[PDB]
């Protein structure tokens, strides 16, 4: 039957969820499963083995965090099943899995097997009435109130650029590169090892994520700023320690614009955006340059878009008006857009029937993938 | 005129037979899909056992 | 706005439109 | 379904759909009704605007009716 | 022209009758084959029961 | 039933139509059917699967263009039907295909099947009360005042020469080659490929047309600029790129004067006209050399008049006065002539009624072909 | 005085070489430039900073491979200078460029700047006494020993057809699309990314090429084989792992007959051959449909010509004998023919001497294009 549908954004690091017709995701919690790595002696301790949810951040000094989704592709399927059940848990949604149409998102160009296996989970473990899997870009266009644009996002693990012109998506112009937030944080962790801090545990890694979200900032000209010393921010650990970052506060998010630093022949995020535009036709290049829509949490770096303008302006043709729109709700654009598309009747004319899935299987979702 | 009369009769009655045989084919196509699902059920029966 | 406060991370005090200047 | 009733009822409701959707379009075309959607678009409450532009079957209705 | 209309009407209707009989009878074959598979699945399931 | 006949200039490059009596054609949209290439994902996108005219000129990049008519001969009847339906649509005329007489032009020497099927469409799909098929030569004379002359038109697909003297056409002197604007654009495309700029998509083919119309001229001499290897004038593309051309903005339009470049033995446009004059009667040469009318969009190149004069002057006998009347309405001359002819009352006697066609058929059209 | 000329056969992916009068190209190496990615630390490492030849293949994991000739057009002249010097180096020829004539090969319809810059390279850097740029179809006809034929070759980056009847080439019936082996390799990389295998490294593209050249076949019925979920054959690696290719080993070579898979509207290889024959004369079609000669590397797939026969039968007129003659020397046919062409006597007068280039310049090579 069709009750109020549920939108779930499988952000490779932060999963965002809520019902359709809403206006904000009230269920935002990081994506992992934390199991304890210590010994239990005192009866009356914490509860349960796995610790998905806010309890993880509340007791991170005990857990051994494991990420289920690496680069948008799920590795530990059992963890994603536990996380999805936690989304339907009594602390997050309280509904039953056999009650709502599910609007699952997905990073573009993910392997076929990922969609297939997600279908198996949602129609065998959960017995959902309906399911639809879509691109993350289209949703951001819904949440940004537009129809034409190039959604250049940066989730926690996959950055990509999808150029959509007047609601028509151009698949051959999609550029995907697997270097996002986790790689920025991982590279920053390596820099702190060279600064003498040796963060190597799992909880230490999420402390690095907190640093990346708070102390880093992007460059404008990394040589102008490389020849001069900087602020050297003093971040305080929860323990009470004191860490200094130095020039790595701007060298850490340089990995996005240049994967040569991490030792990887790939393209910058600017090259992804510019190529994604240029892989398309010629009559549309000017309009796509005039409508660049960001989303994704790894575009929230301070001083990011200004460097993006200097970069694309350095690459795009002469005097073309490059116009980047970056809203405040970039972190939830895919969720808000999922709510917008799921709050329609075309959505009823757009999902995949449970019966039809049982009759067909993988071929059903690969036909209705767009 | 009689040629068109008798041939409209022939073409329409033959397409009526098309309707019958097409119904039978579609019914067994659904039957094929049904035993695909049934084979999957029995596969789960053998698996559980 | 409260709707863009209640959430954990939001670009507070940042220009929303990045665009090249005039003088084409 | 025009399998039942008379043809007059059919002709009359097709005509009624014409004048009905016609007046509905007159309602929508008014600047205040559009102004409300403009305010919503300014407040970014895209749920209402997008649902009003795509979920209202008025487009295909006016097409098939005309 | 009317005799050519006789041709095409007979040709199209009868050919599609033949093609429908081909798909339908091939699925009847598939139904008997699949029924043999039904018997095998019931045998394996009932044996494990 | 009749009120203001509908004149239609069924030209293979651009279709010009309006009512009778109108001094100017109100609707001149290009003759192509635009279908999308990229899948629609986002709801609320563009509607329909067929884009014609103004819509298929703004969203050109999203489309794939299929020309229906090529060399004055219809290939896909479906497409021509859709274009004619577009003409009678709300955005173009808001009329019915049963209340107005229809004057549809045609190039000379077209096969009988075009006339037959054209009338079948206008008498079966459209229930047009009156249809009259004309020549695309007489109409230019009407719209230019003259009654004696050599109509040398060069549409986008077929150029020809019709010598008309005092209202009498001499059909055996009609020369017709199928080499015009399309071939010039296509050959310009091959020159850009030799200059390193490829174009293969159908949507980018109109950019080649745009180059032709905005940058191609005709040198007065074929060798005074050939070995000179002139400057490379730049030309901007719709995105903001840059194309320098040089030896192709004059080498591409010489295809009309010598089609040996395309690898086809035929006669050049000058030989078309001169042979059409020389095939006529001995007494009628001076009046035809002093009455040359130009029409068609390909007769708008820079230096076209000077080249045409010098070529005819080389081929005509000595001291014969050669006047080439070149009006400013070379694109709409045939249409304006149609608006004149349909505004007369002799046209009532010249058309074909519906019952005339029903009782007779194609025979009635071949009877009133002239 | 003159010596034995050098046949520097180009290629978009493989550059062949060898002296004239030979029978086997004794010095074949891929046309790519490899420079180190990592940092040299030890003393006694590899030296050179640019590695071309078998040494580059020996250290693929250490070099950032990049091709300088894309779609037959030279994109990096400096890298081509290095490659041509490597041809004359002490590892492949051990001779001097000042003592030998050069027979360079180019694809048809190339930009004039390639010929002009090739002239400046071989006449200003290399002080070659005589250069003669030839086509590639004629050479394969020389290699097979025939006089007539439709040479349908498919290099790494350019597939083209040049119908030649009795030693006479038709420069207007030459089709040429930039969709070949390298692009099929890139498309296969895309399908392996859709199957769950990353190959983003440029040095890993060679592994993708090995997959294409070793476990790919052309299915006769495309979608009929697409519906059947194949055995998913396992292929090794230059690592030791195992990849299950699956369905992406038959639809990956379907790009050659369906350029729609890459999103670019163009013709298929079969359409190139059929259109190259139909664009020729009327009395020259049975002999051209008979003598169909293949060449190029990409024409080595399993069942290539069998599907070619099927498609040609779908496009050629009824009951016409077709002979797709594919010799076993399809890879080196152009070089064998270059040896035969340079080993003749008229070749002495076919080239462009150094004095001729000093007198005229680029004009001399442009005059002797065929
Ligand atoms: N204020 C911030 N500054 C820099 N990076 C941030 C900030 N907030 C979030 N991020 C990055 O965004 C990531 C959140 O990933 P996210 O974009 O939510 O994935 P998804 O969007 O697919 O859910 C975090 O891991 C963090 O690295
Ligand atoms: N200003 C111009 N200069 C040169 N050529 C033009 C110009 N404008 C249009 N053309 C060419 O002439 C064609 C105009 O079509 P037209 O001559 O009307 O063909 P038709 O007569 O069949 O409608 C265009 O397709 C274009 O090829
Ligand atoms: N045995 C093979 N099977 C299939 N494809 C091959 C084989 N050998 C080479 N190729 C393809 O052919 C290309 C080389 O073709 P080649 O004739 O050298 O092109 P060119 O001469 O233009 O460089 C390689 O890139 C490869 O993709």
Interhelix angle E2-48/B2-48, rounded to 10 degrees, is 10
Name the closest ligand to CA A256: 1
**CA dist., res. E12 & res. E19, Å (int):** 10
**CA dist., res. F40 & res. F231, Å (int):** 45
Q: How far is A300 from chain C (nearest CA, A)?
A: 7
User: Do G298 and G155 touch, CB atoms closer than 8 A?
Assistant: yes
Which residues of chain A does G200 touch, with a Cβ-Cβ cutoff of 8 Å?
177-178, 264-266
State the DSSP string of chain C: -GGGTSSS----S--SEEE--S--
> Are A145 and D41 a contacting pair at CB < 8 A?
yes
> Are D47 and A21 a contacting pair at CB < 8 A?
yes
| Residues A248, A238 share a domain | yes
Q: How far is A350 from chain F (nearest CA, A)?
A: 10
Experimental method: cryo-EM
| Residues F127, F16 share a domain | yes
Give the distance (Å) from ligand 2 centre to CA of residue F234. Answer: 22
Which residues of chain F does D50 touch, with a Cβ-Cβ cutoff of 8 Å?
43-44
Touch A-F: 3+ C-beta pairs under 8 A: yes
Number of structural domains chain F divides into: 3
Touch F-G: 3+ C-beta pairs under 8 A: yes
| Residues F201, F92 share a domain | no
Give the distance (Å) from ligand 1 centre to CA of residue A190. Answer: 19
| Residues F362, F251 share a domain | no
Touch F-D: 3+ C-beta pairs under 8 A: yes
User: Do A180 and A153 touch, CB atoms closer than 8 A?
Assistant: no
**How many other CB atoms are there within 10 angstroms of residue G59's CB atom?**
14
| Residues F173, F98 share a domain | no
Residue F228: give its domain's CATH number: 3.90.640.10
Which residues of chain G does F195 touch, with a Cβ-Cβ cutoff of 8 Å?
111-112
Residue G170: give its domain's CATH number: 3.30.420.40
| Residues A159, A130 share a domain | no
> Are A326 and C24 a contacting pair at CB < 8 A?
no
B vs E: CB pairs below 8 A: 75
Q: Which two tokens stand for residue F224?
A: 């005074």
User: Do G199 and G189 touch, CB atoms closer than 8 A?
Assistant: yes
**CA dist., res. B33 & res. F22, Å (int):** 64
**CA dist., res. A77 & res. D38, Å (int):** 45
Name the closest ligand to CA F137: 2
**CA dist., res. A367 & res. A369, Å (int):** 5
For residue G204, what is the nearest residue in chain A, using CA coordinates? A265
Ligand 1, pocket-test mutation among A18, A28, A176, A181, most atoms within 8 A of CB? A181
Which residues of chain F does D59 touch, with a Cβ-Cβ cutoff of 8 Å?
47
| Residues G64, G30 share a domain | yes
Domain boundary among G207, G237, G266: G266
Q: According to the 3-state scheme, what is the secondary structure of chain F?
A: CCCCCEEEECCCCEEEEEECCCCCCCEEEECCEEEECCCECCCCCCCCCCECCCHHHCCHHHEEEECCEECCEECCHHHHHHHHHHHCCCCCCCCCCCCCCEEECCCCCCCHHHHHHHHHHHHHHCCCCEEEECCCCHHHHHCCCCCCEEEEEECCCCEEEEEEECCEECHHHCEEECCCHHHHHHHHHHHHHHCCCCCCCCCCHHHHHHHHHHHCECCCCCCCCCCCCCCCCEEECCCCCEEECCCCCCCCHHHCCCCCCCCCCCCCHHHHHHHHHHCCCCCCHHHHHCCEEEECHHHHCECHHHHHHHHHHHHCCCCCCCCEECCCCCCCHHHHHHHHHCCCCHHHHHCEEHHHHHHCCHHHHHHCCC
User: Which are the contacts of G357, defined by CB distance < 8 A and separation ≥ 6?
Assistant: G119, G123, G131, G364, G365
Q: Is the shortest distance between the CB of F156 and ligand 2 below 6 Å? A: yes
Q: Is the shortest distance between the CB of A269 and ligand 1 below 6 Å? A: no
Give the distance (Å) from ligand 2 centre to CA of residue E23. Answer: 54
Touch C-E: 3+ C-beta pairs under 8 A: no
> Are A326 and C17 a contacting pair at CB < 8 A?
yes
Name the closest ligand to CA F215: 2
CA distances from G352 to F181, F265, G89, G132 (A): 38, 31, 24, 6
User: Do G139 and G341 touch, CB atoms closer than 8 A?
Assistant: yes
Which of G96, G102, G174, G167 lies closest to G138 in space, CA to CA?
A: G167
User: How does strand G69-70 pair with strand G73-74?
Assistant: antiparallel
CA distances from E23 to E37, F139, F217, G121 (A): 20, 60, 64, 67
Domain boundary among F211, F236, F266: F266
Name the closest ligand to CA A107: 1
| Residues G283, G158 share a domain | yes
User: Do G177 and G160 touch, CB atoms closer than 8 A?
Assistant: yes
This structure's resolution (Å) is 3.5
**CA dist., res. B39 & res. F79, Å (int):** 49
User: Do A35 and A130 touch, CB atoms closer than 8 A?
Assistant: no
Kindly give the number of the ligand 1 atom that is closest to the alpha carbon of A136.
Answer: 22
User: Do G167 and G185 touch, CB atoms closer than 8 A?
Assistant: no
Q: Is the shortest distance between the CB of F18 and ligand 2 below 6 Å? A: no
**Residue-wise burial string across G324-336, b where 16 or more C-beta atoms lie within 10 A, e elsewhere:** bebeebbbbbbbb
**CA dist., res. F194 & res. F248, Å (int):** 9
Nearest CA to ligand 1 atom 22: A11
Which of A145, A365, A159 lies closest to A269 in space, CA to CA?
A: A159
Q: Is the shortest distance between the CB of C15 and ligand 1 below 6 Å? A: no
**CA dist., res. G15 & res. G89, Å (int):** 14
Strand, helix or coil for residue A17: strand
**CA dist., res. G67 & res. F149, Å (int):** 62
> Are A323 and C19 a contacting pair at CB < 8 A?
yes
Ligand 3, pocket-test mutation among G107, G181, G327, G329, most atoms within 8 A of CB? G181
Q: How far is B21 from chain E (nearest CA, A)?
A: 6
Kindly give the number of the ligand 3 atom that is closest to the alpha carbon of G216.
Answer: 4
Domain boundary among F215, F250, F266: F266
Which residues of chain A does C12 touch, with a Cβ-Cβ cutoff of 8 Å?
328
Burial class of F219 by CB neighbour count within 10 A (0 to 12, 13 to 18, 19+): buried
| Residues F261, F237 share a domain | yes
| Residues F235, F257 share a domain | yes
| Residues G243, G159 share a domain | no
Which of E31, A358, E46, A125 lies closest to B45 in space, CA to CA?
A: E46
Angle ∠(F152,F153,F154) on CA atoms, nearest 5 = 125
| Residues G108, G252 share a domain | no
State the DSSP string of A23-55: SS-SEEEES-EEEE-S---SSS----S---SHH
User: Do A8 and A15 touch, CB atoms closer than 8 A?
Assistant: yes
Out of G170, G172, G264, whose CB is closest to F262?
G172
Q: DSSP E strands: which ranges in chain A?
A: 6-9, 14-19, 27-30, 33-36, 63-66, 69-70, 73-74, 102-106, 130-135, 149-154, 159-165, 168-169, 175-177, 234-236, 242-244, 292-295, 323-325, 352-353
DSSP-assigned beta bridge partners for residue G102: G6, G131
User: Do G261 and G186 touch, CB atoms closer than 8 A?
Assistant: no
Kindly give the number of the ligand 3 atom that is closest to the alpha carbon of G157.
Answer: 22
Strand, helix or coil for residue G353: strand
Which residues of chain A does C24 touch, with a Cβ-Cβ cutoff of 8 Å?
319, 321
Structural domain harbouring A214? 179-266
User: How does strand A149-154 pair with strand A27-30?
Assistant: unpaired
Considering only residues 21 to 40 of chain E, which have any Cβ-Cβ distance to chain B shorter than 8 Å?
21, 23-24, 27-28, 30-31, 34, 37-38
Out of A23, A300, A321, whose CB is closest to C9?
A300
For residue A306, what is the nearest residue in chain C, using CA coordinates? C18
Out of G38, G194, G201, whose CB is closest to A112?
G194
Q: Is B47 on the interface with E (CB under 8 A)?
A: no
């Amino acid at each position: 039957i069709a009750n109020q549908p549920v939108v779930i954004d499988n952000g490779s690091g932060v999963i965002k969820a809520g019902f359709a017709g809403d206006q904000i995701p009230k269920y935002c919690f990081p994506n992992y499963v934390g199991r304890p790595k210590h010994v239990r002696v005192m009866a009356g301790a914490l509860e349960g083995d796995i610790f998905i949810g806010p309890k993880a951040e509340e007791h991170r000094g005990l857990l051994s965090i494991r990420y289920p989704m690496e680069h948008g592709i799920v590795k530990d399927w059992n963890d994603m099943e536990r996380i999805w059940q936690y989304v339907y848990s009594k602390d997050q949604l309280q509904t039953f899995s056999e009650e709502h149409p599910v609007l699952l998102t997905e990073a573009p160009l993910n392997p076929r097997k990922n969609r297939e296996r997600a279908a198996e989970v949602f129609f065998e473990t959960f017995n959902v009435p309906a399911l639809f899997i879509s691109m993350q870009a289209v949703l951001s266009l819904y949440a940004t109130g537009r129809t034409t644009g190039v959604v250049l996002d940066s989730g926690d693990g996959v950055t990509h650029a999808v150029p959509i012109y007047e609601g028509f998506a151009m698949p051959h112009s999609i550029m995907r590169i697997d270097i996002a937030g986790r790689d920025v944080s991982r590279f920053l962790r390596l820099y702190l090892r060279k600064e003498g801090y040796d963060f190597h545990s799992s909880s230490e890694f999420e402390i690095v994520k907190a640093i990346k979200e708070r102390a880093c900032y992007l460059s404008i000209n990394p040589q102008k700023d490389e020849t001069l010393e900087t602020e050297k921010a003093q971040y305080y650990l929860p323990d009470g320690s004191t860490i200094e970052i130095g020039p790595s506060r701007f060298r850490a998010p340089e990995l996005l614009f240049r994967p040569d630093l991490i030792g990887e022949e790939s393209e910058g995020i600017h090259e992804v955006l510019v190529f994604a535009i240029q892989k398309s036709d010629m009559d549309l290049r000017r309009t796509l340059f005039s409508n660049i829509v960001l989303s994704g949490g790894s575009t929230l770096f301070k001083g990011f878009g200004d460097r993006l303008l200097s970069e694309v302006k350095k690459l795009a043709p002469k005097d073309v008006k490059i116009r980047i729109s970056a809203p405040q709700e970039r972190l939830y654009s895919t969720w808000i857009g999922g709510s917008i598309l799921a709050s329609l009747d075309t959505f009823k004319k757009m999902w995949v029937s449970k019966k039809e899935y049982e009759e067909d299987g993988a071929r059903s979702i690969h036909r209705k993938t767009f | 005129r009689e040629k068109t009369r008798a041939v409209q009769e022939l073409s329409e009655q033959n397409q009526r037979l098309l309707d019958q045989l097409s119904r039978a084919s579609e019914v067994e196509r659904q039957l094929s899909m049904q035993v695909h699902a049934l084979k999957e059920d029995f596969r789960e029966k053998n698996s559980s056992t | 706005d409260p709707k863009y406060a209640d959430l954990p991370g939001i670009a507070r005090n940042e220009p929303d439109v990045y665009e090249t200047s005039d003088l084409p | 379904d025009p399998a039942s009733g008379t043809a007059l009822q059919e002709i009359s409701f097709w005509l009624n759909l014409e004048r009905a959707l016609y007046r509905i379009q007159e309602k929508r075309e008014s600047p205040e009704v559009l102004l409300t959607l403009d305010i919503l678009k300014h407040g970014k409450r895209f749920h209402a605007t997008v649902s009003f532009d795509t979920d209202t079957g008025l487009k295909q209705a006016l097409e098939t009716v005309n | 022209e009317k005799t050519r209309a006789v041709q095409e009407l007979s040709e199209q209707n009868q050919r599609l009758l033949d093609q429908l009989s081909r798909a339908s009878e091939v699925e009847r074959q598939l139904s008997m084959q699949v029924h043999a598979l039904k018997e095998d699945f019931r045998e394996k399931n009932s044996s494990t029961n």
